[PDB]
Design a protein around this nucleic acid. Structure first.
Lengths: 101, 271, 46
RNA sequence: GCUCGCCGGAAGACCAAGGGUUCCUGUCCAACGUUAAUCGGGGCAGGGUGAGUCGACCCCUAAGGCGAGGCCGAAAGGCGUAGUCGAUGGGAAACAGGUUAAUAUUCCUGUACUUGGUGUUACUGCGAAGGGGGGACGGAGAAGGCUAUGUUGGCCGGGCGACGGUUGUCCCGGUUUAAGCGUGUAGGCUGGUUUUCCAGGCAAAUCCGGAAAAUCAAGGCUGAGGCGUGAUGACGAGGCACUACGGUGCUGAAGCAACAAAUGCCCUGCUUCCAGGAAAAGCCUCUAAGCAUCAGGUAACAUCAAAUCGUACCCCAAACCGACACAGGUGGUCAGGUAGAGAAUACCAAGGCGCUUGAGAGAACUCGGGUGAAGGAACUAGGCAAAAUGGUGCCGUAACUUCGGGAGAAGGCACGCUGAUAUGUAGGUGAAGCGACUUGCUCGUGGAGCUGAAAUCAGUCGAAGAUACCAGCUGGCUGCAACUGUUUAUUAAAAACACAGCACUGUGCAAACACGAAAGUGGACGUAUACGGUGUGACGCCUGCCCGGUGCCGGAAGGUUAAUU
RNA sequence: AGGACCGAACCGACUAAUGUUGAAAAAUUAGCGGAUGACUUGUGGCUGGGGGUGAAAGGCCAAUCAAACCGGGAGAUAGCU
């Protein structure tokens, strides 16, 4: 069985978008950001425990980060820097009949 | 039977084929097959060590009984089969205990014939005996060189060996090359000649017919540049040198056998 | 016309990848030289 | 937005590889874009990739790689056994509708399926790194049965014509519906069932193989398609509404038949040929050690589990390989109409585009084309280039020949449309009706309906009927090479190389020979009708003389001759 | 049946023209050869520099080949400019 500390780790944030809002209002589906190494069983247990709702099924995907470019000044001189935003995991959690936040 | 094809196209004009109605048409006997992947004439270093090898048709190896060890049990010949790994064709024999094997088909053999091996086997074509028990002057084939090793001599399509003398522990054989050789009298042999003696009468007819036997083109040494072959260049067609192999050894006459371990068994060298 | 570079990730990794460099001592010497130079990318592995 | 033009076996659609956010929305126009730019594959910000069934991973192995011990090697290291990796190959299961600005076999709706774990019940011999089946395999050719798909008719809805006519042999549109489950037929293969026995399957077996006997061949495997159900559901022309005129919402007719059909399926079939056409696991089966009222196996039911990673977008291209938004290169799949043999070609559909500088002018000259009086190779190194020929059917066709060829030799003639034969023929398909049977996915007869060449006779228009696109120039004498092939990627395609055939020569198997300080490997799991080397080069008639020189083969009496002593 | 015939895909590269600071560091256009085979093609693998491979041209071995490329001996040597 999954320990409670793991469950308190795996849930990162609710994900806000019009796709997420439409999913909630159509299919009773909750979209979250989760830890990149969280399995579907872990997400199911975490939602069922920390949110006190009953979960039907979890769908997950990994989002690759984009390249972001911005400048940093280093000793009276602006230099252009480039780097990639970190990947993250998105969970589509379908609720049986409960209401969430 | 050898058949000439009609000249309905070049590449068919000079084709002579050996057709054999009694050869089996179906698939071979599956338990006696293995895979035989081609090499291209390359060794484990990946280098060409024998030239003019490559391509050709895919082939499966048939395990042929060269030892003929099942003594005292009769066998009947089920069918003659085509074998792509040799010039002779093979026979599928069923032993009275229910085991099947492949043997080289002797000259007169056909389906229904009875064969046997051992000291007490009758003196008939297809029968395998120690050469101690074969009359002097007999024509035999698939001859053992060491007792129990398996037949090594006279295995090609029309070949055979003559037992010309028996002197103590050794018999003297006349080989197809004309060489006289001594072998132990305990070595086995099969009576008769190998069948398919019409093999030598086939004419390939076209370049492609040799390409699908796995033979690649031979480039004449004199057609190359001096860096590639001792038969070097020249403006036009020049030779001016003694013929040699690509590695500089005089071909066309120079003897190359050097085996003092074996010289005691050669009564006479071929001529 | 066909040009010389005809990419394939599997062939790239099998020829110049990290595990291919580590398999022989000459390839291990390639890696040591690149570490000594301070290269940001040791191999084609990505 | 309306016209015009272009592609349409692609310049459309879907991928693999490769790329890596280029995808969708909002904003900006410095730079980038061969011009402008309000636009963009550009800058900035936000969003977007949802799987038990698709793919990867995973089980299995090919070529090959690595390789405990091992065998070799100054060291480094080489090879390799047990093994372990390695797909481009074999191993379980999902379809149809709907939906987003951007994902869908992944979300939703409806209807399914597979594998495994764990319990309950019932019945029970279970049990391998072992045996046997199976998986499991070539090329070519020829049906026949089908389907995708198309055409026409019927049906349903709409229409009655910007200019003569158009209530009809009139016009336009639609007539769709899957996996699964049930049935098991066109076809393909194979005799079946018992009983006894055993020198085989490294051991043993009830399995495989073999040998007898009896008794029925009337049994079984396999297999498209059709049919039923899935589905009183979904979709559906079009209407009725709202609207921000984007678009959203509601309702919804008919939804059949005949003919023609593949390169797709039956078919991993069948026939035939020689050059004789992977492996291993999943799967089925047999026992060994072992376990014995256990454990295990079989079936039904219940329940749970099917994780992880990919999924956006381009993908014959402005996202890949070519330094470029480069006339180049790049594997797979789908393939609609009218002509047509056709995937050629012309014009079109669905769909997609007008190629990121324009505007004028209408000189020489250059480029790509059209046509030319009279002449017709006089041109020129040379008919280079151009022009010409070009289809189908029929008639006819020389020398020479290896009897196959030459040969589409050459050279001619008929081709459109309309009517009749015949309101559509020969042929193809084939319904009702009817007869049988072993009684329905049946058989025989029948001929409705549909489709439909070719020919002959008569007439008719034009300068011209293979009318466009498409589509052989022909003949004569000679050199060389027999022929199909191969080559100097990027100035040489040839008479050069190869070739089947010929000869000489080496090689007795631990073969000669080749790669290797070696071990080993190739030659070959071949064995003198075999293998290597060399020259010649289909076939026909042939291949003369010379062994003094240089090689090679044999011999050894004698002379000379190393280390050593 | 066929290294059979005509001819698309596909694979080549015989002729001409254009192009030659190209649209292109070998192409385009019009013709041309093969097109069931000694064919062609995807994906992997193996052979390494006096070495490979070669139906043989000193062909090809990353736009490089009568001895690849990179680094080193190395500031080789240069009675020559």
């Amino acid at each position: 069985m999954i320990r409670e500390e793991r469950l308190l780790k795996v849930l990162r944030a609710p994900h806000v978008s019009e796709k997420a809002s439409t999913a909630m209002e159509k299919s009773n589906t909750i979209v979250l950001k989760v830890a990149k190494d969280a399995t579907k069983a872990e997400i199911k247990a975490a939602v069922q425990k920390l949110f006190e709702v009953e979960v039907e099924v979890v769908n997950t995907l990994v989002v690759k980060g984009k390249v972001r470019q911005m400048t940093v000044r280093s000793g009276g001189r602006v230099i252009r820097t480039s780097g990639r935003r970190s990947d993250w995991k998105k969970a589509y959690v379908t609720l049986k009949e409960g209401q969430n936040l | 039977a050898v058949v000439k094809c009609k000249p309905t196209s070049p590449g068919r004009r000079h084709v002579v084929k050996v057709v054999n109605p009694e050869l089996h048409k179906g698939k071979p006997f599956a338990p006696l097959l293995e895979k035989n992947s081609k090499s291209g004439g390359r060794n484990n270093n990946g280098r060409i060590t024998t030239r003019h090898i490559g391509g050709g048709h895919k082939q499966a190896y048939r395990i042929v009984d060269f030892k003929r060890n099942k003594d005292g049990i009769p066998a009947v010949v089920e069918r003659l089969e085509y074998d792509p790994n040799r010039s002779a064709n093979i026979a599928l024999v069923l032993y009275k205990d229910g085991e099947r094997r492949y043997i080289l088909a002797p000259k007169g053999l056909k389906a229904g014939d009875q064969i046997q091996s051992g000291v007490d086997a009758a003196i008939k074509p297809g029968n395998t005996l120690p050469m101690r028990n074969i009359p002097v002057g007999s024509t035999v084939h698939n001859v053992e060189m060491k007792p129990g090793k398996g037949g090594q001599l006279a295995r090609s399509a029309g070949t055979y060996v003559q037992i010309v003398a028996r002197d103590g522990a050794y018999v003297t054989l006349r080989l197809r090359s004309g060489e006289m050789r001594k072998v132990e009298a305990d070595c086995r042999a099969t009576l008769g000649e190998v069948g398919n003696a019409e093999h030598m009468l086939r004419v390939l007819g076209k370049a492609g017919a040799a390409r699908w036997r796995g033979v690649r083109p031979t480039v004449r040494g004199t057609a190359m540049n001096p860096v590639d072959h001792p038969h070097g260049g020249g403006e036009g067609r020049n030779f001016g040198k003694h013929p040699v192999t690509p590695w500089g050894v005089q071909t066309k006459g120079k003897k190359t056998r050097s085996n003092k371990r074996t010289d005691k068994f050669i009564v006479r060298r071929r001529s | 016309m066909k040009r010389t570079f005809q990419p394939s990730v599997l062939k790239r990794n099998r020829s110049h990848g990290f595990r291919a460099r580590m398999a022989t001592k000459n390839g291990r010497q390639v890696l040591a030289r690149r570490r000594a130079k301070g290269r940001a990318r040791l191999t084609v592995s990505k």
